[PDB]
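Q: what does this look like with chlorophyll A bound?
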Amino acid sequence: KSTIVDFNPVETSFEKWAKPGQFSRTLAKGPKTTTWIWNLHADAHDFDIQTNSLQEVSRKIFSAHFGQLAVIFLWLSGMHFHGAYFSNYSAWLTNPTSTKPSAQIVWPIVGQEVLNADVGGNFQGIQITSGFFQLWRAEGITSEVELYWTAVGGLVASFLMLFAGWFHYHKAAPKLEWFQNVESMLNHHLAGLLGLGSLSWAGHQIHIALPINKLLDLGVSPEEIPLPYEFILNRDLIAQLYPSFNKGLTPFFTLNWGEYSDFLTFKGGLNPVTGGLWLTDTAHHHLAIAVLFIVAGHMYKTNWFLGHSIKTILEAHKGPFTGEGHKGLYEVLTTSWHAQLAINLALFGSLSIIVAHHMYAMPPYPYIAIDYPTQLSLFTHHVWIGGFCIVGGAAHGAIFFVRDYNAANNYNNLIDRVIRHRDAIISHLNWVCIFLGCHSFGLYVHNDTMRALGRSQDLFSDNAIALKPIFAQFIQNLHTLAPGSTAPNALTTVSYAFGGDVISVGSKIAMMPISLGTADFLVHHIHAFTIHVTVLILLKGVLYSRNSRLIPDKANLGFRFPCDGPGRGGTCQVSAWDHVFLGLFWMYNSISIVIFHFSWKMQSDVWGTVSPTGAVSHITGGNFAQSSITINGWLRDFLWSQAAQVVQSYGSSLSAYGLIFLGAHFIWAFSLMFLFSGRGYWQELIESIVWAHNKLKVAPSIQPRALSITQGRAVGVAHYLLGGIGTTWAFFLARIISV
Amino acid sequence: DIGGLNPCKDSEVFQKRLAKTVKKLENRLKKYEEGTPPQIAIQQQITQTKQRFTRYADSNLLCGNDGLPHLITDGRWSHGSEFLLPSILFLYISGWIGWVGRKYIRTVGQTSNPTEKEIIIDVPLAISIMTSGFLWPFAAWQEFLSGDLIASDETITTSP
Amino acid sequence: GDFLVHHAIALGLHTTTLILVKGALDARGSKLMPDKKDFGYSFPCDGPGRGGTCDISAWDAFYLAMFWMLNTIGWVTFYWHWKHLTLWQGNQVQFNESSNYIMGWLRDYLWLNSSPLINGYNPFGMNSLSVWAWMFLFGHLVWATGFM
Amino acid sequence: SHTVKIYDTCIGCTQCVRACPTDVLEMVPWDGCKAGQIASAPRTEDCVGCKRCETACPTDFLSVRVYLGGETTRSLGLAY
Amino acid sequence: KLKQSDFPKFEGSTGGWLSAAKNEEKYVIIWTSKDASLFEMPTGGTAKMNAGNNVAYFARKEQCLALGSQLRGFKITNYKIFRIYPPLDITLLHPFDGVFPEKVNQGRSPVGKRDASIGGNPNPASLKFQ
Amino acid sequence: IQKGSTVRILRKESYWYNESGTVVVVDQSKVRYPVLVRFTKVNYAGTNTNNFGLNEVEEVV
Amino acid sequence: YTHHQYIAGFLMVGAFAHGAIFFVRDYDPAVNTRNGEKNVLARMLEHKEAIISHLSWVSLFLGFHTLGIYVHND
Ligand code: CLA
Ligand code: CLA
Ligand code: CLA
Ligand code: CLA
Ligand SMILES: CC1=C(/C=C/C(C)=C/C=C/C(C)=C/C=C/C=C(C)/C=C/C=C(C)/C=C/C2=C(C)CCCC2(C)C)C(C)(C)CCC1
Ligand SMILES: CC1=C(/C=C/C(C)=C/C=C/C(C)=C/C=C/C=C(C)/C=C/C=C(C)/C=C/C2=C(C)CCCC2(C)C)C(C)(C)CCC1
Ligand SMILES: CC1=C(C/C=C(\C)CCC[C@H](C)CCC[C@H](C)CCCC(C)C)C(=O)c2ccccc2C1=O
Ligand code: SF4
Ligand code: SF4
């Protein structure tokens, strides 16, 4: 009878496994039409409509989190197992600059063995662009046995998380008060999870990754490198590489932290041997992060007369312009899972995009900057994940507004005041979007039409009307001057992208000053415009989710509904879901432009080879500066030019990329059937098909119905995203692996 | 011969294709070492390529000017193994599938909960019906004769 | 290749005919709307009721079949133009070999013959084909505004 | 303004009237059904065409039918 | 603070009526509440009722009726909606005969009633050029 | 026709036209559509029952 | 060739659209029916389900197999 958990709440039985749709009150009666099948999967994780108790929803969410973490652990275990058994990691360790990472071999069936490429190191397989080899090298993993043991540990951890989910749904489910301890949860997630994870990783780096990687960079082969445990039992194997361990932990406890400058450095730049960040800098960074997060975890009052109450902090932040201020926000975020999901997903996607930027900007792994496929894939993948997560955060904000928003509890607070002037916000955001689009894109079109008319001096180019990004160049200058002036204890700039020397590893450029000209001005304003339009769609969905001048009772129709009818001139897509659908489209557009800008700019003005005398030759040859300012330039010098490797991949080991290119084109075009058409035509065609089936006595008892309007839109957008992202995926991968 | 094509056994371009593929595979084989699994895999590829080309040559297959086997599907039994025999095989298999599906639909359509037995299959009855589809050509021309294959006017029609 | 593309043309013709004939016959009513004749040839819908009635009018059948007509005419004209480009250039073996698979079309017709068009104006100069490149981009833009 | 017609298949279940967002339909006495009531459309000038009325109709092919016609600031749902 | 004492304690929203409800028509909903309950405006956000007479103005009949439907959740039933033309031309709209349209009242005549089902509608070809 | 009888729907604008249903109750009052028929197949609106006139239903033998 | 083929497609779609318009607004079942029996045009609305079902079957057949052969070659 614990005060935090309920014991044996749900019986572990297979009876409900044999009753599909048991969770829903409407679906439990059984299918009558094929719409029931689709409704079954669309409501599976909508725990809000399955129970009327916040406690049950919270417990379901907790167990679902455990299942998701078990799935993630299984995926990581699979990655490590493939590295251990079906990879050339050992060969890549001895030749990182000449062996391509491969960790998946393809069975010899139907002639598909051509996919096993010549990745080097007496190996055949698919080249890997996830950068696991570089990460494992940075971890100090020098043998495939360690990868096997990490895979075994991942399997054990996945089983543990599965057992935890089962235990906390069926044997000991926490109570609502336990879930609502946001102060305790924040304290623990900030100190324990974040800070202690940073501290543990700093310890691992210092004791395992720092010596092993230093020996690897010194040229010591992985076979004669001591086993990682020997660096702990023997204080002399690590005190030779870093002659500060001879003093032990006495400098730490005597506040003489200057003695540890051997392995806790602040250098900046990149390791000249590997092209990645100095691992001493990384260990010092993780140590500082650990201390900062542990300190930050002692902020909120949990069980003693010590710390802050988030309710008292929010309620004190009022103002003349904001009425009641943040009063009621604590009740909103402690009684609505959707609001928490909105905030967490938005910040999580933004964090993913920031991670993507800082990855290539400052390569943190050895021999990852010179693996161009890995860098391109990591950036594009993380930016895509960030965009998807941001759209999801907007969607769940809209869901909270529709479902969990209480008008009485939010009288004259920030949420109320935002809804009260939603018109002004949306109208000014509309004006900003029109201004930004007009300018950015019409400058592009003006360049295109001036070039087409033979007026080269009328373009918005560097040798013409020039739009120099002076503000960004000022920041670039400030960073390259930071070491010794504003960061006096730095030896080198944080990233060579801001300026400095060309860093090359094995005649391949790792990082180099990224010059910003009029071409970068236009593409940056294109980014701003696309982001603003996506924000416009999502914010219009969130703010007008409850009511509008069209439908004053839109909240009574729910978050997900197709329309209110053909009246009022037509009320299609007025939902808030139909705004997360359009916003998904515009996020695809924005992220596609972002990754295109990254790919072309890097290939044209960063990546390449360096001659022995110091001459820099890039992959494309600097065509970004003069040919990325017109749409015809993007079509020809980027799309047409770099699509050569994809279309000429047939018969080679990259033929799978051409096949996926074609299939993604097919899927993207397939999406337009659902996006352009309507439900009535398909229902009436199914009518004649059903007539034929009845004529042959083969009409199913479950009456076949065309997909609902909302499901038609969902299928269309899912296929559109899959096709477009897969086309860009195949194009990028084939292009950056070939060259 | 038929349509201006020639047998692949006497098509020079066919042998040129075989030689070029084998040469590419051997050049790939040259860059690996000893009896290592990559060399074994490439050698197996070479052997399979040679076997496939030899089988296509000795298969009554007509090759065009590009040295690729062309299919003669006008209906003549001479090239009957290209389309006609696979056509019969597919017709048998697909008729089996359709017959067992229709029989299952009509069988569980006379129970208390026909819709339940469509998402949750009666595996015993399903297995009973599925292995009975080998007589689908005979069953179809024994149910059509009895009038049990086609509905007449209980089928629904739209307004016009 | 001619065989396969003729079957593609037949598929396009049959699907366009299916859409148009279905719209014509179902114009006076169906099960979802047994009084469609009372609403005229062109009306938006019958509402979200009865499961949803988007694009239920006969005009919507024309609207959907226009896409299929454009696709079928595109297939026909692609086939004709590629066949005649290979015939005029002399490399009829290029069509006879690469026309049997989709990537052959994408690489040897579109990607191959689009090179002169896109270089109608470059950062170095322009040709009398510059107007055609501008019209190319204009058509892409109007296509995507239609997508809007 | 749109046109709304009521047909004698009406069973007087009132679901159309309580679904109208603009107070167009009302229940009036009748002798053609068990409930003794039939829907009426005396305020079609306020009809917006949202067709919520016939989404709540349980009869087989509807007893209330909305025929969209000429548009008005009331029928277009214009707050401006 | 506010023009009239019977107005709900609303802080004003940029979602209210526009120049249309000054030269074409405006709609006013009146009701009496026992408690100063906090309710959501059909236009903007949260407003506070008056413990007594309450009067609200809107640009559409649908907005007033949505507010009235919300009022039913507060056990408020006596709400009445009027239409005001550009001058003070008041016309009672929603409780037209004092009884809600969902309840049958004597004195109502059927409007728009056809004495046949849908299938009895005339063929459009016979309704050409009239 | 009576309760439990099987009838064929003759109404053309019906989701169950030409189909067979089960009569739930035939009203003896002066209503226009007294016959209430229940069907196994739900219509597009989800309902599985409807009131029919005496001349719109034909009893199955 | 391109101009005339595009014009041809437009004209065919217009022919079918105007056939649909004739069905909606000009077709009279009474004129095309004599004592219950229906004439050659009115009978097209009786087996309309058969026509649409077989058009759908032909379209699915051709699409499935043309795409299958093309993707097999790919
Ligand atoms: C220092 C203590 C501590 C630590 C380390 C964590 C760590 C975590 N919590 Mg958690 N939590 C804590 C205290 C702590 N919590 C307290 C005190 C409360 C009550 C307010 C909660 C309430 C809570 C909820 C409601 C949820 C979490 C979730 C999570 C996970 C977030 C997912 C993630 O970042 O993946 C990082 C993943 C890893 C690093 C994998 C290794 C982590 C393992 C499992 C150690 C977990 C520590 C655990 C608390 C020890 C208990 C053991 C048990 C025998 C008592 C993460 C594993 C979320 C989640 O995913 O649910 C499962 C979630 O929904 N926590
Ligand atoms: C932490 C992440 C997270 C979580 C927990 C949720 C959770 C939820 N979301 Mg949500 N969402 C997210 C991210 C997330 N979402 C993101 C990133 C987006 C933007 C795209 C959305 C957009 C979104 C919408 C628009 C809606 C939800 C809804 C929901 C709720 C019901 C979900 C359900 O039943 O789906 C069950 C799961 C499925 C139906 C799976 C569908 C399969 C997907 C679409 C395809 C995946 C393809 C995959 C990549 C493989 C393709 C490869 C190919 C080759 C085969 C639930 C509370 C719905 C709701 O009603 O909320 C109350 C709703 O309407 N969400
Ligand atoms: C190439 C196709 C295309 C184009 C041009 C646009 C353009 C636009 N969309 Mg988008 N959209 C598209 C496809 C496209 N969309 C697709 C496929 C979808 C489906 C998901 C959407 C969905 C969508 C939504 C949901 C939203 C937009 C919005 C916008 C507008 C953003 C404001 C802006 O930049 O206006 C400026 C106009 C342009 C940049 C277009 C070109 C104008 C030129 C360059 C300058 C002026 C030329 C001059 C006037 C010509 C005069 C001569 C002439 C008279 C002969 C803009 C009109 C948002 C909106 O309403 O606006 C705020 C919005 O909310 N779109
Ligand atoms: C000689 C042939 C012919 C004739 C006499 C008619 C006559 C008629 N048709 Mg018809 N039609 C035709 C061919 C023909 N059509 C073809 C070929 C098609 C297939 C595309 C159609 C499709 C069609 C439909 C779908 C409909 C009609 C309708 C009508 C009737 C009203 C027309 C109307 O309102 O126009 C209105 C005229 C316009 C809206 C102008 C549209 C102009 C288009 C958009 C092109 C202009 C853009 C231009 C190319 C700019 C270039 C851009 C630049 C940048 C390059 C009328 C009886 C309508 C009706 O109600 O019938 C009873 C109806 O719904 N027709
Ligand atoms: C990779 C991976 C994995 C593994 C992992 C691991 C292996 C981990 C480890 C971890 C660890 C191994 C951790 C540790 C930690 C520790 C700690 C965190 C400690 C701390 C301590 C402290 C904090 C103390 C303090 C103090 C006191 C209290 C008193 C005296 C003074 C002083 C200050 C010292 C797995 C398989 C799962 C899955 C896959 C991935
Ligand atoms: C082979 C040969 C021959 C023959 C040929 C032929 C016989 C052809 C035919 C052809 C044909 C035979 C064609 C046809 C076509 C058709 C079409 C193209 C149609 C269309 C239709 C439509 C469009 C319809 C419309 C409508 C509707 C929808 C309904 C209402 C009415 C109307 C009519 C309006 C000869 C001996 C001479 C010589 C050479 C060889
Ligand atoms: C075709 C179509 C239908 C009909 C589509 C249906 C009935 C879907 C049928 C799906 C089948 C029955 C199952 C899926 C079969 C696939 C082969 C499985 C997916 C492939 C896997 C690899 C995932 C609609 O209902 C619709 C509704 C609204 C707008 C547009 C449309 C629309 O375009
Ligand atoms: S069906 Fe399509 S069009 Fe008709 S109302 Fe619903 S959404 Fe608007
Ligand atoms: S449309 Fe249907 S619902 Fe909207 S008002 Fe007119 S009748 Fe009432």
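The helical segments of chain D are 52-55. Chain D touches chain E at residues 3-9, 14, 17-18, 20-23, 25-30, 36-38, 40-44, 46, 48, 61-62, 65, 73-74, 77-80 (CB under 8 Å).
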